[PDB]
């Protein structure tokens, strides 16, 4: 009959890996419609918007995600990534450092992803 929020997040995830980013973001939006209290739907959609260069939309989604889950490592990382592409370097670095702390606190292991992003955040800032 109808897709559940879980079906739609699953569809969006497959579309995301398929580099179908606008279609993926619409699936996450439909998941939000069915349950607007899931931070992960918003951080997932934020990352689509990043891939689509719609940074202002990505910011908004990260901010909504932080209202729902203040501990979200990816909400902080995508926020830092977004502010980085917008030449907002001090805010980007702060958010990447905050993702790093939260990931350590939550025992998440993204390898060197967060330290690498921080090095680029500081390098790009210095080169500017």
């Amino acid at each position: 009959k109808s897709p559940s929020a879980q079906e739609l997040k699953e569809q969006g995830n497959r579309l995301f890996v398929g580099r179908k980013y606008p279609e993926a973001a619409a699936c996450y939006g439909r998941a939000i419609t069915r349950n607007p209290l899931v931070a992960v739907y918003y951080t997932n959609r934020a990352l689509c918007y990043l891939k689509m260069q719609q940074h202002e939309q990505a910011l908004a989604d990260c901010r909504r995600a932080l209202e729902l889950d203040g501990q979200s490592v990816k909400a902080h990382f995508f926020l830092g990534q977004c502010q980085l592409e917008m030449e907002s370097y001090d805010e980007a670095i702060a958010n990447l450092q905050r993702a790093y702390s939260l990931a350590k606190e939550q025992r998440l292991n993204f390898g060197d992803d967060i330290p690498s992003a921080l090095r680029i955040a500081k390098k790009k800032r210095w080169n500017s």
Partner: peptide
Amino acid sequence: SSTGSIDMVD
């Protein structure tokens, strides 16, 4: 490659 990248949806 043993860790999934952070640049990915959940």
